[PDB]
Amino acid sequence: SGAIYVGNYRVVNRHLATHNDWANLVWEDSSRDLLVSSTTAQGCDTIARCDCQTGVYYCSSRRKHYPVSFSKPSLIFVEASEYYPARYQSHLMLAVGHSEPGDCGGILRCQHGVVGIVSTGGNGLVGFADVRDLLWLD
Ligand SMILES: C[C@H](C(=O)N1CCC[C@H](C(N)=O)C1)c1ccn[nH]1
Ligand SMILES: [Zn+2]
């Protein structure tokens, strides 16, 4: 679990969005595994606007942060799950690291701010849904 709180927006994994997220929907994209809902309280997270390919992510299944080198956002084939059929997930960045299903939502950050959230895992890999291109979040 986990979300990004920026301005009047909450960014979550679309497959973990709650009934309240869908009732306050701003934007969603199944191909990116992202959903953004509106909030009444002001969020104070900062979104990075950069081309970093290194950062640190939070892994809830280890209660630890890990440094990672990750690929640029791209279209990656993701196997079928209970949430989606087999498909290409866009704007996805991969790194070598630990990620179990409940780790989705963990933030990846660089020195500029929030880069994205954990969205995929298994096999000693961790995949992050990029949010740096969503300029409207600010
Ligand atoms: C194995 C699982 C996973 O990659 N998916 C299931 C949950 C939905 C994911 C998606 N983005 O399509 C894919 C996962 C998450 C985090 N660590 N391991
Ligand atoms: Zn950066």
* Tokens describing residue 3: 């979300």
Q: How many domains does the chain have?
A: 2
Closest atom of ligand 1 to CA, residue 81: 6
Closest ligand 1 atom to the C-alpha of 104?
16
Resolution expressed in Å: 1.4
Q: Residues 35, 84: one domain? A: no
List the one residue out of 84, 62, 94, 65 whose CA is nearest residue 13.
84
Method used for this model?
Answer: X-ray
DSSP 115: E
Domain span holding position 10: 3-44
In this structure, the answer to whether residues 9 and 76 fall within a common structural domain is no
| C-alpha–C-alpha distance, residues 132 and 80, integer Å | 26
88 near 77, Cβ under 8 Å? yes
Identify the three-state secondary structure at position 103: helix
Looking at the fold, whether 52 and 36 belong to one and the same domain comes out as no
Same domain, 21 and 64: no
User: CA angle at residue 49 from 89 to 136, to 5 degrees?
Assistant: 75
Tell me which of 21, 59, 103, 104 is the catalytic residue: 104
Residue 33 known to be catalytic: yes
15 catalytically annotated? yes
Q: Same domain, yes or no, for 88 and 30?
A: no
With b meaning 16 or more CB within 10 Å and e meaning fewer, what string describes 41-74? eebebebbeeeeeebebbbbeeeeebebebeebe
